[PDB]
Design a protein around this ligand. Structure first.
Ligand code: 00G
Ligand code: YB
Ligand code: ZN
Length: 606
């Protein structure tokens, strides 16, 4: 049961294919066109079915060349409105028909952000991008908006001729639009069956540069050269991922670097990963995000969570593979360092939510819960900790990687639950079932709070970070003079970040200590977004008014929710900046991403 979807479930009917024919209207901020769904009955005598929609205007529904009856039910909040379609002839089991729906989206579509020219790099043209995960595809087109259903798709997208459209699919040509010579039609094909949350579209002034045998980077012209360098490890990571996961089946692996309001670090859209431009550190230091998105090409896009209650299957396994890729590139001690950092992020989330909160369970129950509200580090890092614990229990990384590749092979092109995963784990490790029975499954999978057992972590790269954090924390005023730029001499950017993460866990520190830290380390000069984020949080939580305009600037000049949400919350919690924090949100909200605007407003109680 997919409690996030109002559509007929997969046991009743299933979409096999979507043919999308649409036009992007920047004057009206609407997409208008037809969604032709090829649907296969799973029941005898099927006479109706229901699709998910959200803020869509339906013009008509056509089957066998005739208009048919349909009805839109009452809106159910963030789930949207169910659309019931009256089939003209009762279908037998396995029979397939094509249902062609004429629709138009709303400018407030929660799947979409429409940007004016001023919100782009080039300042001449507008830009549109989508983000369907988890349940926003219904705000673009009517569909069974559940990851329990997989479908292929084709699309034809008409756009102003000076712009470029891309989708999560192989590019299948471009022509002038016969209905309007001021336009171009871009065509697409996704021959591999996917869940509809992986449908993606961007329209803008995009240019491309090849950076590997199967990878172009796409962005506005101003970002191309920098993106090419930043993500140059992409091919080497794909080769390692193929070694761990089996064949890459999607053809191309292209990258799209979005404008700064993109809400996530990345989105694993097939053939075309979307990334934040906050990855552009200049030194490739945030490339774990690329490794993560690459890994989703197996865990998530091939083996998929059957409902969003089982999101940890997607995310936990992906973090596990991510950390292996980075460990192959940079060493097993670095994999452990990153693993242990992730446990720290899990501590933070559990402390933030509260150790008994339902969203700290590994498997969650999203009945009446908006996935965007529930979203956190938990499925990522509690899922990873479980897998890392199991790795250690069952004989080490070589052995557990054998399981992972067998698991991907077994469930490719399928959608699964936590029970499916656990059943297969027991089947694969049939000779170690004694050891598996030692795991407290009920606590790991279903209980809130920190896991019942913490894995073992190599400390080599972490010790210097803890040591320095502890010096600052225990320092008194007469110790502040001993600190100096040389303290950071032998620390990588990853280690500087972890030093800040350790210190932030003990915040506030005294204002004088934070002033000294800027004096000796000049953190204000660091443009690395992960570093700058934690530094500004530490400054604001420690009540440094000088940091207020810096934090406001970072919160608004980009929109990755990982950074924007906690910066606004911190600024709201500081009495000196509270009124400005809400004013700034109020002023910006109309031009923010619709999901980000929603969540920041809830965070700020405005
Ligand atoms: C990374 C890139 C896009 N997203 C969208 C958020 O999606 C989800 C999906 C599934 C979820 N289960 C619980 C919260 C939750 C949130 C997260
Ligand atoms: Yb002293
Ligand atoms: Zn992910």
């Amino acid at each position: 049961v997919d409690t996030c979807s109002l559509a007929s479930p997969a046991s009743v009917c299933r979409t096999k294919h979507l043919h999308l024919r649409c036009s992007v209207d920047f004057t009206r901020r609407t997409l208008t066109g037809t969604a032709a769904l090829t649907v296969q009955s799973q029941e005898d005598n099927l006479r109706s079915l229901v699709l998910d929609t959200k803020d869509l205007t339906i013009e008509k529904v056509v089957i066998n060349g005739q208009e048919v009856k349909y009805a839109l039910g009452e809106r159910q909040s963030y789930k949207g409105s169910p659309m019931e379609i009256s089939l003209p002839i009762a279908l037998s089991k396995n029979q397939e028909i094509v249902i062609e729906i004429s629709f138009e989206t709303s400018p407030k579509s929660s799947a979409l952000q429409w940007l004016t020219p001023e919100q782009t790099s080039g300042k001449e043209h507008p830009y549109l991008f989508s983000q369907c995960q988890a349940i926003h595809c219904r705000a673009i087109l009517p569909c069974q908006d559940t990851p329990s259903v997989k479908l292929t798709y084709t699309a034809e997208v008409s756009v102003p001729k000076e712009l470029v459209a891309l989708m999560s699919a192989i590019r299948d040509g471009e022509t002038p639009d016969p209905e309007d010579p001021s336009r171009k039609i871009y065509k697409f094909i996704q021959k591999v069956p996917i869940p509809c949350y992986l449908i993606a579209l961007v329209v803008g002034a995009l240019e491309s540069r090849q950076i590997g045998p199967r990878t172009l980077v796409w962005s506005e012209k101003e970002q191309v050269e920098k993106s090419a360098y930043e993500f140059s490890e992409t091919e080497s990571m794909l080769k390692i991922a193929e070694d761990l996961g089996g064949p890459y089946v999607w053809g191309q692996y292209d990258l799209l670097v979005l404008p700064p309001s993109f809400p996530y670090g990345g989105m694993e859209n097939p053939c075309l990963t979307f990334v934040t431009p906050t990855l552009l550190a200049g030194d490739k230091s945030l490339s774990n995000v690329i490794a993560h998105e690459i890994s989703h090409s197996w865990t998530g896009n091939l083996v998929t969570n059957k409902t969003w209650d089982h999101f940890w299957l997607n995310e936990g396994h992906t973090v596990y593979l991510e950390r292996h890729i980075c460990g192959r590139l940079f060493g097993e001690k670095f994999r452990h360092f990153n693993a242990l950092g992730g446990w720290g992020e899990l501590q933070n989330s559990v402390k933030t939510f509260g150790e008994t909160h339902p969203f700290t369970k590994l498997v969650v129950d999203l009945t009446d819960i908006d996935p965007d509200v529930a979203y956190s580090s938990v499925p990522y890092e509690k899922g990873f900790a479980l897998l890392f614990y199991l790795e250690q229990l069952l004989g080490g990384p070589e052995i557990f990687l054998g399981f992972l590749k067998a698991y991907v092979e077994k469930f490719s092109y399928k959608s699964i639950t936590t029970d499916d995963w656990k059943d297969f784990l027991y089947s694969y490790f049939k000779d170690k079932v004694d050891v598996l029975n030692q795991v407290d499954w009920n606590a790991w999978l279903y209980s809130p709070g920190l896991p019942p057992i913490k894995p073992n972590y190599d400390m080599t790269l972490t010790n210097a970070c803890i040591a320095l954090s502890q010096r600052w924390i225990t320092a008194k005023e007469d110790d502040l003079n001993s600190f100096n730029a040389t303290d950071l001499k032998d620390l990588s950017s990853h280690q500087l970040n972890e030093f800040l993460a350790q210190t932030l866990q003990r915040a506030p520190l005294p204002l004088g200590h934070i002033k000294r830290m800027q004096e000796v380390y000049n953190f204000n000069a660091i443009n690395n977004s992960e570093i700058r984020f934690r530094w500004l949080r530490l400054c604001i939580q420690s009540k440094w008014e000088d940091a207020i305009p810096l934090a406001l600037k970072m919160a608004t000049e980009q929109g990755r929710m990982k950074f924007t949400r906690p910066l606004f919350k911190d600024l709201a919690a500081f009495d000196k900046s509270h009124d400005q924090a809400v004013r700034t949100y109020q002023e910006h909200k109309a031009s923010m991403h619709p999901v980000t605007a929603m969540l920041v407003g809830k965070d700020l109680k405005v």
